[PDB]
Amino acid sequence: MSEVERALDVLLQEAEELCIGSSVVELDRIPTALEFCREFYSKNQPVVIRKALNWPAIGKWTPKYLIEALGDRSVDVAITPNGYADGLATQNGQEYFVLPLETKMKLSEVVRRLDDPTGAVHYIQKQNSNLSVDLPELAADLRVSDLDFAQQSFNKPPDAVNFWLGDERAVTSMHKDPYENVYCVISGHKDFVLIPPHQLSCVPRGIYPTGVYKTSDSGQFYIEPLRDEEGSDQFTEWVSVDPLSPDLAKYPEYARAKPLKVRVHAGDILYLPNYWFHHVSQSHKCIAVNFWYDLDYDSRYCYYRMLEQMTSA
Amino acid sequence: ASMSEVERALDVLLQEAEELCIGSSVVELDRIPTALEFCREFYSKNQPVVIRKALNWPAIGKWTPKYLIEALGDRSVDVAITPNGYADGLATQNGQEYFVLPLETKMKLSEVVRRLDDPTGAVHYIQKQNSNLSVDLPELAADLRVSDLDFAQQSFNKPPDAVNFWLGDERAVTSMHKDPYENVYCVISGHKDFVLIPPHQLSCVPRGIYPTGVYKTSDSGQFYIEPLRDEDQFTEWVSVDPLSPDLAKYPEYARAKPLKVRVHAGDILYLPNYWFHHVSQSHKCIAVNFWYDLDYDSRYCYYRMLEQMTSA
Ligand SMILES: O=C(O)CCC(=O)C(=O)O
Numbered sequence A: 001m002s003e004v005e006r007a008l009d010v011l012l013q014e015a016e017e018l019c020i021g022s023s024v025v026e027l028d029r030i031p032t033a034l035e036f037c038r039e040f041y042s043k044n045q046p047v048v049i050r051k052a053l054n055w056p057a058i059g060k061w062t063p064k065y066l067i068e069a070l071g072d073r074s075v076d077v078a079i080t081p082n083g084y085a086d087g088l089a090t091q092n093g094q095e096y097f098v099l100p101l102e103t104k105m106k107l108s109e110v111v112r113r114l115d116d117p118t119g120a121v122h123y124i125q126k127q128n129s130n131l132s133v134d135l136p137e138l139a140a141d142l143r144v145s146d147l148d149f150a151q152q153s154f155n156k157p158p159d160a161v162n163f164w165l166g167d168e169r170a171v172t173s174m175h176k177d178p179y180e181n182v183y184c185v186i187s188g189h190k191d192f193v194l195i196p197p198h199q200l201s202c203v204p205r206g207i208y209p210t211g212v213y214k215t216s217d218s219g220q221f222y223i224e225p226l227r228d229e230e231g232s233d234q235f236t237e238w239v240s241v242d243p244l245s246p247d248l249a250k251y252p253e254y255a256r257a258k259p260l261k262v263r264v265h266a267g268d269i270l271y272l273p274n275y276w277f278h279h280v281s282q283s284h285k286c287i288a289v290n291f292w293y294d295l296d297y298d299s300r301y302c303y304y305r306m307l308e309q310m311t312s313a
Numbered sequence B: 001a002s003m004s005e006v007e008r009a010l011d012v013l014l015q016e017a018e019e020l021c022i023g024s025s026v027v028e029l030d031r032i033p034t035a036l037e038f039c040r041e042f043y044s045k046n047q048p049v050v051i052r053k054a055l056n057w058p059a060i061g062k063w064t065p066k067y068l069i070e071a072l073g074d075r076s077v078d079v080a081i082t083p084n085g086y087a088d089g090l091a092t093q094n095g096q097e098y099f100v101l102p103l104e105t106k107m108k109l110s111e112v113v114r115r116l117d118d119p120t121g122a123v124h125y126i127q128k129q130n131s132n133l134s135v136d137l138p139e140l141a142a143d144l145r146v147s148d149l150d151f152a153q154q155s156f157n158k159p160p161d162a163v164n165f166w167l168g169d170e171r172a173v174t175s176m177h178k179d180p181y182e183n184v185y186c187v188i189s190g191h192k193d194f195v196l197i198p199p200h201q202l203s204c205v206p207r208g209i210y211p212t213g214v215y216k217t218s219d220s221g222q223f224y225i226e227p228l229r230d231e232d233q234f235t236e237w238v239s240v241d242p243l244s245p246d247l248a249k250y251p252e253y254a255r256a257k258p259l260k261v262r263v264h265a266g267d268i269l270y271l272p273n274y275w276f277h278h279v280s281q282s283h284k285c286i287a288v289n290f291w292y293d294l295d296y297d298s299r300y301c302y303y304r305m306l307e308q309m310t311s312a
C-alpha cells in the first residue's frame, strides 16, 4: 500500500480503537455549560437531548395554526420533481448537482401543495436565517435563552436561525457545513444519518456540473445548467453515495464508514458539530428550527484540509 | 514527483495552519479565567496560555533552600547529575551521538544545595518527575493550595496523574520533547524560559533515532556514557537545538514558528498535550507542575497519522 493509504489506515484504526465519533450521545437533561463545552464542543461530538424544550411552539405550531397566524405571509419555498433539493440527478446522460426551483408563495398555498401527494415536492428550506427574515413573529413562541448551555461554548449569537417545514418526500442529501448546528424539532420527527469528518476517506465525493430545476411552458420539470458569463459550466463538489442504499460495488471504501442514525422528536435538541456529514429525512409536514454558529478554527480544520488533499483525484 | 504525495499533504497542512496562525502565540492573561473560559478558549483549542501573578501560595516566598532543608528533615532526595547540563539529551562519545539519561543518585538536600553552589562541579537537578512531590515530598503540599487550579482541572475532569517538584542549576537544560499530558506548570521561585512548538509543526522539527546511554562516573569521578542494553537500545529524539538552530543541516526547521515565554514566580503556564517544549531556568529555580492524562479526541488521531507520515 501507498504511503498515503498507510497514513489513512492509521487514522481510521486509531479512531475506531478510541471510539472517536462512534455514537450519538443521549442525554435526558440539559447539561451545564461547562459539561457541554468539555464533553461535546471540545470533542466535536454530537449529542441529542431528549425532551429538552417545552417552548410554546411545541404543541401549538400546526399547519392550521401557521395558516391562521401567518397564512398570508409570502415565504420562499423550494420545489423539486424528485424530492432532492441540493442533490444529484441525471438529464440526457449527465449527472448534475441540482439546486431547487425557488419561488415565493403564500404559506397557505405551500400547505395546500404539501397536502397534494401527486404534485411536485415542496419544502420551506431556505436557511439564510429565514425565521428572523420572513417569520419573525414566530420568535415569540421560542425561548432561545434555553440554548445558553450550548451558546456559551460558541460565545457568539447565532449567525442564522432557520425555519423548516417540508414534505416527507423531501430528503436532504449528505453534506457538511462549516457551522455549529443546534437543531430543535417542533413537530414530527427528523431522521439523521451522520458521518464524522475523520472518515472523509470513506465518503466518495465527485465534481459535478451545477444546474437548477425549471419548468417548461407545458409544466415539465427540467435541469438548466448554470454557466459563467464566458459560457463555461459551473461545478460543485458533492458526496456521491446514497447512505440509505449504498452501492458498495461502486464505492467499496464506504464499507469502512460507520454512519450513525439518530431520530430527533419534538422537543429534542440535536447538536450537530461543525464539518460532520449529515443526510436528513423527515416525517410529513415536520416543523423544525435550527441555529447556526460560525466555527472557531483550530488545528482540526487544518488536518481536515490535509485529508481532503490526501483523498483528492 | 517534484514532491511526494505525503509531502504535498504536509505542505497543505502547514499552509492552512500558517494562514490561520494556529498556535502562533501564547495568550497572556492577568486574571485567572473561569472554568468555562478555560475550557472554551484554551483546552478545546489545544492552546497555551500564561497567567501572570495568578498564585499567592505561601510557598512563593517561603521556599528557600534553608526552608526546604528544615521542612524535609534534610531527607535524602533523588538527584539527577550530568556533566553537560543535558539530562535526557544528546551527547557525543567516541564519534557516536547518544541520547543520554542522567546519573541518578540520592543525597541529603544539604549536599545538593552545596553542589548547586559549585560552578566548577557537575550539573545537579532535582527533577524526578513520576509524581515526586506527592509521593516523595508530601510535607510541601501544606504550602500550596491545589484547588486554585480548579479553573483548569474542571476541563480535564480528573485528578492529576502526577505532581512534580523541580529544583535545578541554571546550567540544567531540558532538551526539546513532547508529553502525552495536559500540563499546568507553576513557578515558585525564579523563572523558567520555554521554547514551544505546536504539534501540527511536527514535520518541521527534525527527529533522529539514537542509541540510548546513561551517564556514569569513572574511577576518578569523571563522567562517561555507558550504552544501554536489553538483550542495542534506541530512542527517537528531537535533533535540533532551538537556542541556536543549524538551518543548513535542518532547513525544514526554518518553517517552524517557535514561541518564547518566560514564566515568573506566581505565574501559571498551561502547556497543552503534545506541544514540543524546551526549558531553561534561573539558578536554583523551583517549580511544581501537574500532569493530567489526555482525553482522546479526533485531534489526537490526526496527530498519530501525522507521526506516521513524518516517521523519521
Ligand atoms: O432539515 C433538513 O432537511 C436539513 C438540515 C440541515 O442540513 C442543517 O441543519 O444544516
Ligand SMILES: O=C(O)CCC(=O)C(=O)O
Pocket: B166, B173, B174, B179, B183, B185, B192, B277, B279, B280, B287, B289
Ligand atoms: O522544568 C523543566 O526543566 C522541564 C519541565 C517539563 O518538561 C514538564 O513539565 O513537562
Ligand SMILES: [Mg+2]
Pocket: B260, B261, B262, B263
Ligand atoms: Mg514572556
Ligand SMILES: [Mn+2]
Pocket: A175, A176, A177, A278
Ligand atoms: Mn446542513
Ligand SMILES: [Mn+2]
Pocket: B177, B178, B179, B277
Ligand atoms: Mn515535559
